[PDB]
Amino acid sequence: AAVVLCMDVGFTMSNSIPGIESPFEQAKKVITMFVQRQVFAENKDEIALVLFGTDGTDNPLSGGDQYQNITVHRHLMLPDFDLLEDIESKIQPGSQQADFLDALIVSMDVIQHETIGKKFEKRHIEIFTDLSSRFSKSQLDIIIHSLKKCDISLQFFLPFSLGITEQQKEGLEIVKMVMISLEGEDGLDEIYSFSESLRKLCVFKKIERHSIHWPCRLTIGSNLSIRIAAYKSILQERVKKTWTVVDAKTLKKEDIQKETVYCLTEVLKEDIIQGFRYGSDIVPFSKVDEEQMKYKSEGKCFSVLGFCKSSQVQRRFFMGNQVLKVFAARDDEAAAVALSSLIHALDDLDMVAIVRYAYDKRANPQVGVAFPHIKHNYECLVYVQLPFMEDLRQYMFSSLKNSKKYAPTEAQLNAVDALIDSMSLAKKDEKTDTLEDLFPTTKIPNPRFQRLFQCLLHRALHPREPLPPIQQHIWNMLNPPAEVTTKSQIPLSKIKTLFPLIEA
Amino acid sequence: CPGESLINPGFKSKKPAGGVDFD
Amino acid sequence: GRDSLIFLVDASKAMFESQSEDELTPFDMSIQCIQSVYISKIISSDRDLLAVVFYGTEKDKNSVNFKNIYVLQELDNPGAKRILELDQFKGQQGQKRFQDMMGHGSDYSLSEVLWVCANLFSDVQFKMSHKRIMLFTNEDNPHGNDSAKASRARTKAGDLRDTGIFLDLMHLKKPGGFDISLFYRDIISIAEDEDLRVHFEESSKLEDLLRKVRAKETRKRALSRLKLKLNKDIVISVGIYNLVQKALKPPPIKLYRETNEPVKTKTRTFNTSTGGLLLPSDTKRSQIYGSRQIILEKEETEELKRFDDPGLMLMGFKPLVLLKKHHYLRPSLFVYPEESLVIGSSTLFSALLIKCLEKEVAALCRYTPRRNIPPYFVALVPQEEELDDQKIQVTPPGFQLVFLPFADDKRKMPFTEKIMATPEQVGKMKAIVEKLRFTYRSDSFENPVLQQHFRNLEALALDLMEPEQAVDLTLPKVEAMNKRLGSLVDEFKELVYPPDYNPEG
Amino acid sequence: KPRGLFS
DNA sequence: ATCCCTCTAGATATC
DNA sequence: GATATCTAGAGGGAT
């Protein structure tokens, strides 16, 4: 995808109400936060920057008085910290006025001439302006035809949401007409304000990985086989890149070496033998002898051992570090019908399937549960690993219900009941038990990656400063909404005076 | 006290395995 | 504390004999039971202490110098050498070896034998949680011959009882029954099973003794001791436990070539330019983004993981219906109050548990297991205590700590079109599902890799001819399933699969 | 529907 | 000081 | 080139 940012640096954006930040500053902030997301989310996208309204003129097209006061500050290339430095420092407001239609002409010229030799699935042009520059509409027809031919999308970012001068009102008329002529009536939803754009770009792009296609066959016995496809659905995501150890005086990873040594006091690597502990004794156990005596299994098995009631498989026994979603084989109507029958049969009987799962011939076989998961767009089985006999810890804890010492009174129970009502994180709506979540905790990006990217970005731009504190907006999304905290001020006070807590 | 391991006191004796037994 | 067990095997006058001629003698049956305990103890708890003492022989090997009692092994951790030593007497070809190095034909006093066992316990340097003695005998006559020493035996037995010794009994084969309570019923712990029958069948609790146990059997310990904070000033102390933990193969040990001794290993980092050595403070961590190299110190790398102090912070209460079963991230933990840190935590913990169960809500909290780790969002699902028909607890009361996933933890799924199945097809599959119903228990399957690994270690340590092959219980019973289903599969395939489909390709 | 600057 | 358990990094196949 | 697994090193608490 190729993105071209067309920003206005005209004189009209320099001055505004002193009670609010200048639109030039807001556009600069929006563009900077967009580049930060692209840099730390390596996706091979190309970004080009075009400025109109500056004193200098630098365009492939010059002609006469037209196509002037516009500069192609940055060509079409991968984003980098050089762009961030140039945006922060080099870019300064101008003093001239330029037609944003003419700037749109140059943006097409940049995106058309510099796209040769490369394949782009999408093409976008972003316009940052306040529509306060006098201009003449005399070419609109050829632009609309050009965009429909080149298949390039547009977005507009105005300092006001969709007390303005008629020039802005008149300028709004053309941009409304353009969006209608390009992408219909819902094109009205593709015009944004600097405030809401700032809100949507306050966080870094979430780490995304593509689950691989894992084909297998769901076997029930020997004469029944269903072709299935499994993908990893939920897992503990890790960082894409790890830290690299480099020398402190040259900053090179090739100038250091990591090695292991064995002492009894010096032993060579070829004079050691693998061994195992058997009680108080040590027995030699050769690695080559191990693989001869290792458990051997035929890999890639998805076999149903049997079906049991859903209530017999408690959620607290789930093990493993992944959740698999099992779909039918791609482009297979016969397999889709067969798998659908199994899913609906399990759901109607409220049963689950106990299956044996092995990733491949090098994988340890597993025993898990496959329960139906039916939605209005798709249906599939969900596989979660189940524990073995050796993985269960049989601990015993003293009971609390029949304890005289720790029996709460009726007054203490009432105080706790009041707290739970006040600290509710969900609300019923429409009188139809429609529970909406006031704190989903599932749409929240992981704060670990947000903090890490903030420190990396700060160090790169300012290599001689300490790490900044955690961003305020990070804390806000890690805390419940303010109305929840306010409502619990009184019930929490009652608990503090009713439950005597003493630290020994 | 019934429900204990004669080998390891403090742990209840574990029922032996046998996997799937159809009804 | 460490478990301690002492086996006391008799060889007085007739434990090398059988009423039949094709079954095991009492002596080697007891030896087989002892060997099974060593193998079970090695796998389960290698830290326990075990010993074998023989009484009624002609010789004596003990630190007390009392005749007719032989201590083959003192209290120590079990090992492969001890099992091999006991193998010298297993069955035939070892009875004469036992009757040559040792021998029957000497009178014994049971009072003195308990004294030797008591002295063995006192010699232990470690702390013993349980001190047990297992009697292996099938003959109760001599105590009736001399009541004077019989009175001393029960007098000594009472002394051992108040000391903390829990003496047990394991009767062996004897014609005419074991005539219990003629002299016994006052030496043993007599906890239960006071059956007046002479027990013509002479194996009461040797069946489970021979049942080998292959599991880690870890004792109870708290994973962490955190503080549950309702707000900044209301703090209670709770303990975190893991009721499920993935059992792993024991790590291999590096051994020297000929002398076969463990070797300590350490990792050193050196610069290849000079061949010297580099301290951990002489290197920096680096990453590459864009076209720039970012350099950070080791301390700064750790300091960017610090968000909150360890503990649980209450965010709010969420209805249980808002927790998705398919939103599983990692194994759940168990939360139980701890009164040894904050006095009064149990009272507040129980009140929260009671109301949460009544209103069917889950306490959503921010979880920081320890210092310098980014927090997760967890839900404390209430969990009521479950009791079986034997009044034995099976589900402890407390809170179930369920990890919730972030936006980064969810993967996008490929687009597929829904294909609804006709009711006829669903009906046929319902019959198939009903045919293969079975009752599921959490302890119904064993890890095939771990079970096979334990057999391999046992075979090599005991130089057996060939390792025992473990039966894989996770393998589907295709023969049984095919018989149960019958013609259902053929009808279902005809209803769904058109007569040109090839599921194998 | 996120596209353009937001994707 | 030893053991247990989560985390990080390293080695090896299919996609 | 990333994806996914099992194996083999560092590191924080519980007792």
Author numbering:
A (entry chain B): 8 to 169, 196 to 297, 303 to 542
B (entry chain C): 180 to 202
C (entry chain A): 34 to 538
D (entry chain F): 293 to 299
Excerpt from the publication:
To obtain higher-resolution structural data for the simultaneous binding of the KBMs of PAXX and XLF to Ku, we collected cryo-EM data of the Ku70/80 heterodimer in complex with peptides corresponding to both KBMs. (A) Cryo-EM map (2.68-Å overall resolution) of Ku70/80-DNA with the X-KBM peptide from XLF shown in pink and the P-KBM peptide from PAXX shown in cyan. The length of the two KBMs engaged on either Ku70 or Ku80 is considerably different with a short sequence of eight amino acids observed for the KBM of XLF compared to the extended 28-residue KBM of PAXX. These structures clearly indicate a noncompetitive binding of both KBMs, which is expected given the large distance between the interaction sites (approximately 67 Å). The structures reported here and the cellular analyses indicate that PAXX through its interaction with Ku70 does not compete with XLF binding to Ku80; rather, it can enhance DNA synapsis during NHEJ.
Nonhomologous end joining is a critical mechanism that repairs DNA double-strand breaks in human cells. Nonhomologous end joining (NHEJ) is dependent on several canonical proteins, namely, the heterodimer Ku70/80 (Ku), the large DNA-dependent protein kinase catalytic subunit (DNA-PKcs), DNA ligase IV (Lig4), x-ray repair cross-complementing protein 4 (XRCC4), and XRCC4-like factor (XLF). Following a DSB, the first NHEJ protein that binds the break site is Ku, where it rapidly recruits DNA-PKcs to form the DNA-PK complex or holoenzyme. PAXX (paralog of XRCC4 and XLF) is a more recently identified NHEJ accessory protein, which structurally resembles XRCC4 and XLF [reviewed in (11)].
